[PDB]
Design a protein around this ligand. Structure first.
Ligand code: LMG
Ligand code: PGT
Ligand code: SF4
Ligand code: SF4
Lengths: 163, 158, 163, 101, 371
């Protein structure tokens, strides 16, 4: 009968010890520096192959439409007409709607002229959906690098390991 | 070549038909729907512990509906387990295939999927109802001749 | 086209003890009807749920000790065959699985019992799991000593300050 | 409302062949800020929230009467067939007696 | 007590414990679960129908949307179905990279299982604690593949690109840090009295029931069954590395938790062994690599079944070709969709607060349950 009380004692002190262990493990994180990236005052530098907004070169496009076929949804719109003087495909309009785009990278990979590139330009939020229908002028704009914005602290994820 | 399971069945006098092998050499047998409920118990008796997957597919549009069962053994000390594919064919007009839920419980959801996508009705399944599609839906979407009835929210975002 | 193979094969169970595995026996087991009135667990002295060594041991002691001692006539020989059925039911995994499932179905036909529930080969036998890390018990004793000293100090302090 | 993801703006990858995907919640709910991208970067989510704050701070009292519904209704008899719910909640109860050979 | 006493509550698509949009119609008799009915399909995008009328190079982005925690496993099964159909060999370096990525995805999936599980139990801090290191895993993936999730890195007969310079040491440092993090997790959680008393004796599953129900992975291995499809099917290079199949004898949720922790540790050992013995040579198969019109992979006219050991169990693909670019039939065998069907049996005659523990014990994410 006494052994039951003794066992109750030893199975209560153990619980108190493990509760204190949880408290100690959690409170030991107060001595460690925060990992939080303070966006938008701090921005994480994207990788060398980050897939963001498409950049399109109008002069290098041949309207071969393989970027449309390689797309999972045939998203890019290539309006072209034949220039009968030279019988080469003349590009008239190029449009990618980023409301349907998933940034898979098939267009920039299977483009034969390599006129399509992936930039670091995320954060393409707009108030209107139809403003996401970027034409050949909006796609041709150079991306704004976060290294050129000097009001924020650009954060590097890991040491450069280039040594 | 005759498979191990086919040789065992012809030794025990069970009607079937061997359709060959897949790319991995797993035997493929065809079982008539009327004999499938009796043959599933005998299949477990052979030692097929594990109903790995139950699937249904369309042989041809306007044609037969095939239900596929993959079986294997889970046992201690067996190096290479024995796996078998078995297909049961039902007509499109009124597909009826007995349920193996009373042999392997793993079919419980899966046959319902086969009912939801292709309309193959399973007899002894106690809770046969649509599982993935809405419960009030009319039509079987995965059939090759299915046509979506022009819902507004499925159309293009204008 | 072709034809449905194994249409009873025209020989099937050619001589010897016929297999208990059949479509009719399986249908009888499904419906809840005893497929064999003979108790094959009897005539061997075994109990229900015995392992696969006990069936062979019972075969040995029933075919060499009990039967051979009784009579020397050829009626023993057919009696040997009378044993040779039950062993061949209780030694082969498949026929024994069918037999126990039929017995379980016949016992309580109102409720359903799956074949794996009546099978004895489904019990997992894979050895021992990798042990989990050992436990540290020293801080438990430290916490217990701290609390016991706190209680004793409470007793002493209450007695001293009350006076 | 913030529509995050390409599947919430216009349906995304499922805009072409999915038979059950709603192509954008703007067909269901009025969206203030559209956030493009398949898994948008969390910084892009914060940017969309920042733009939402930019629009919120511009509100006046007049916008309140732009927000209450007009609540117009029209009621008729339908002579349809009324049926009870298929999913009644009965599941795995007395299952062993549901064999019915 | 049959009706007007039994409360039918629809703990449905919008519930913090419901991982995604799983619905449970739970019938309660004073906080006692009489039974529950699972309603799924609130995320059914018809992905098997979109699998047809799409080439493989077009369908690959769609693949990561089932099991979005362990994306590399789905990508691996999608790229190894047709490459087995076409008898395409994989170079050794590509196979080692695939093994490393699969084990990293298993680590991440086990982490982001542990988070919501302890959240459903009641502890919210472990969610942030796992996210601190899952962000490091995301950083490694984005450095290698180019994105955190939806990598589109696995390819038929190889991978998209070779590992970048300075990746091996970064992954080794991650492994060294993550071992310490896992020790911290086991110190904080494993012996906690409240965690044990919430977890110790819930969801006892027999081994025979686990086999019959079609369970796989940590669910099946936590019932006394040492069944791992990495060692049974001899997948990739798993026969070359020294690792142990984590299985436990008892059937409760604590066994599943211990199994997933041990699987994380064994996975870390596998990354260490693979990075120590990485081979050279090419990664993309030069035979298949060959303005001109570009066809896709034309599947052969035969059926095929391919399996993988996903962190949630066994993920399978049943592929029927039609001698064309578009497959004739593409059936997905989801581990979570089959592991979920045992939940009404487990939660029957249990309590309301135990449903969260049972459902967190099972690694269910709703994007893989339906397709
Ligand atoms: C500040 C105090 C924070 C810890 C208090 C939370 C509750 C608590 O201790 O329950 C956590 C556990 C719950 O412990 C449970 O309930 C009973 C308590 O004795 C019995 O021991 C049960 O068998 C045990 O499972 O409580 C204890 O074991 C006592 C710990 C005392 C800590 C002081
Ligand atoms: C159930 C209530 C909570 C119980 C557990 C509380 C958490 C305990 C502390 C866990 C983190 C340890 C951090 C170690 C810091 C190293 C540097 C340092 O200052 O160390 C001193 C530790 O300094 C501290 O006191 C740590 C801060 C504790 C107070 C803040 C938490 C309050 C709750 C060493 O002195 P000591 O261990 O003898 O001090 C404790 C002793 O009782 C003093 O007489
Ligand atoms: S693949 Fe490149 S060059 Fe060809 S149409 Fe597309 S963007 Fe133009
Ligand atoms: S990135 Fe992918 S989804 Fe977007 S336009 Fe290019 S191919 Fe289409």
């Amino acid at each position: 009968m006494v052994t039951g009380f003794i066992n109750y004692g030893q199975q209560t002190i153990r619980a108190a010890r493990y509760i204190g262990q949880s408290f100690m493990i959690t409170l030991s994180h107060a001595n460690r520096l925060p990992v939080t990236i303070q966006y938008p005052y701090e921005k994480l530098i994207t990788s060398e192959r980050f897939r963001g907004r498409i950049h399109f070169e109008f002069d290098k496009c041949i309207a071969c439409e393989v970027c449309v076929r390689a797309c999972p949804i045939d998203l890019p719109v290539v309006d072209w007409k034949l220039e009968t003087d030279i019988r080469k495909k003349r590009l008239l309009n190029y449009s990618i709607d980023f409301g349907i785009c998933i940034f898979c990278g098939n267009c920039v990979e299977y483009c034969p002229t390599n006129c399509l590139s992936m930039t670091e330009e995320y954060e393409l939020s707009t108030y209107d959906r139809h403003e996401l229908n970027y034409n050949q002028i909006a796609l041709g704009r150079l991306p704004i690098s976060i290294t050129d914005d000097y009001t924020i602290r650009t954060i590097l994820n890991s040491p450069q390991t280039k040594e | 070549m005759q498979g191990r399971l086919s040789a065992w069945l012809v030794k025990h006098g069970l009607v079937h038909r061997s359709l060959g092998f897949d790319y991995q050499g797993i035997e493929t047998l065809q079982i008539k729907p009327e004999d499938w409920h009796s043959i599933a118990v005998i299949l477990y008796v052979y030692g097929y512990n594990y109903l790995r997957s139950q699937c249904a597919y369309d042989v041809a549009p306007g044609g037969l509906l095939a239900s596929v069962y993959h079986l294997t053994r889970i046992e201690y000390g067996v190096d290479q387990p024995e796996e078998v594919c078995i297909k049961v064919f039902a007509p499109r007009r009124n597909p009826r295939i007995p349920s193996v839920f009373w042999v392997w419980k793993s079919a419980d959801f899966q046959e319902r999927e086969s009912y939801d996508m292709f309309g193959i009705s399973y007899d002894n399944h106690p809770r046969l109802k649509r599982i993935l599609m809405p419960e009030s839906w009319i039509g079987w979407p995965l059939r090759k001749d299915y046509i979506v009835p022009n819902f507004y929210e499925i159309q293009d975002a204008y | 086209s072709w034809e449905g193979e194994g249409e009873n094969s025209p020989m099937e169970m050619p001589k010897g003890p016929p297999s208990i595995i059949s479509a009719l026996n399986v249908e009888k087991a499904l419906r809840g009807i005893g497929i064999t009135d003979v108790d094959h667990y009897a005539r061997l002295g075994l109990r229900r749920g015995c392992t696969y060594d006990q069936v062979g041991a019972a075969y040995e002691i029933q075919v060499k000790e009990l039967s051979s001692q009784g009579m020397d006539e050829e009626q023993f020989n057919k009696e040997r065959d009378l044993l040779k059925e039950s062993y061949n039911i209780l030694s082969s995994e498949q026929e024994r699985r069918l037999y126990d499932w039929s017995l379980a179905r016949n016992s309580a036909p109102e409720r359903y019992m799956w074949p794996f529930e009546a099978d004895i080969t489904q019990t997992p036998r894979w050895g021992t799991p990798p042990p989990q890390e050992p436990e540290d018990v020293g801080p438990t004793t430290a916490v217990g000593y701290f609390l016991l000293a706190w209680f004793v100090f409470s007793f002493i302090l209450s007695i001293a300050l009350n006076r | 409302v913030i529509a995050m993801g390409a599947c919430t703006i216009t349906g995304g990858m499922f805009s072409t062949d999915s038979y059950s995907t709603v192509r954008g919640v703007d067909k269901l709910i009025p969206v203030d800020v559209y956030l493009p991208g398949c898994p948008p970067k969390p910084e892009a989510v914060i940017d969309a929230i920042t733009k939402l704050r930019k629009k919120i701070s511009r509100e006046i009292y007049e916008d309140r009467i732009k927000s209450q519904p007009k609540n117009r209704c029209f009621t008729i008899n339908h002579k349809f067939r009324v049926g009870r719910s298929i999913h009644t909640g009965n599941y795995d109860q007395a299952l062993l007696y549901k064999y019915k050979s | 007590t049959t009706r007007k006493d039994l409360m039918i509550v629809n703990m449905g698509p919008h519930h913090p414990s419901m991982h995604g949009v799983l619905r449970l119609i739970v019938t309660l008799d004073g906080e006692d679960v009489i039974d529950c009915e699972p309603i799924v399909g609130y995320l059914h995008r018809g992905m098997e129908k979109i699998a047809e009328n799409r080439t493989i190079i077009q369908y690959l982005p769609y693949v990561t949307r089932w099991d979005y925690l362990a994306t590399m496993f789905t990508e691996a099964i999608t790229v190894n179905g047709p490459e087995q159909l076409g008898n395409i060999q994989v170079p050794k370096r590509a196979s080692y990279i695939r093994v490393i990525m699969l084990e990293l995805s298993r680590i991440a999936s086990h982490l982001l299982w542990l988070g919501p599980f302890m959240a459903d139990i009641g502890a919210q801090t472990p969610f942030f604690y796992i996210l601190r290191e899952r962000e490091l895993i995301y950083d490694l993936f984005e450095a290698a593949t180019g994105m955190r999730m939806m990598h589109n890195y696995f390819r038929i007969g190889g991978v998209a690109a070779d590992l970048p310079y300075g990746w091996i040491d970064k992954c080794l440092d991650f492994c060294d840090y993550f071992l310490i993090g896992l020790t911290e997790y086991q110190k904080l959680i494993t012996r906690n009295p409240i965690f044990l008393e919430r977890v110790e004796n819930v969801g006892i599953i027999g081994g025979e029931e686990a086999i019959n129900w079609g369970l796989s992975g940590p669910m099946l291995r936590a019932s006394g069954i040492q069944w791992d499809l990495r060692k049974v099917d001899h997948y990739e290079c798993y026969d070359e590395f020294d690792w142990e199949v984590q299985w436990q004898k008892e059937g409760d949720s604590l066994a599943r938790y211990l199994i997933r922790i041990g699987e994380m540790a064994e996975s870390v050992k596998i990354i260490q062994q693979a990075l120590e013995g990485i081979p050279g040579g090419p990664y993309e198969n030069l035979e298949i690599r060959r303005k001109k019109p570009s066809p896709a992979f034309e599947l052969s006219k035969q059926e095929l079944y391919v399996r993988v050991e996903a962190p949630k169990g066994e993920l399978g693909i049943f592929l029927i070709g039609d001698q064309s670019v578009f497959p004739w039939r593409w059936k997905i065998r989801p581990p979570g969709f089959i592991n979920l069907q045992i939940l009404p049996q487990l939660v029957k005659k249990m309590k309301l607060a135990d449903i969260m523990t049972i459902l967190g014990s099972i690694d269910i994410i709703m994007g893989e349950v339906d397709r």
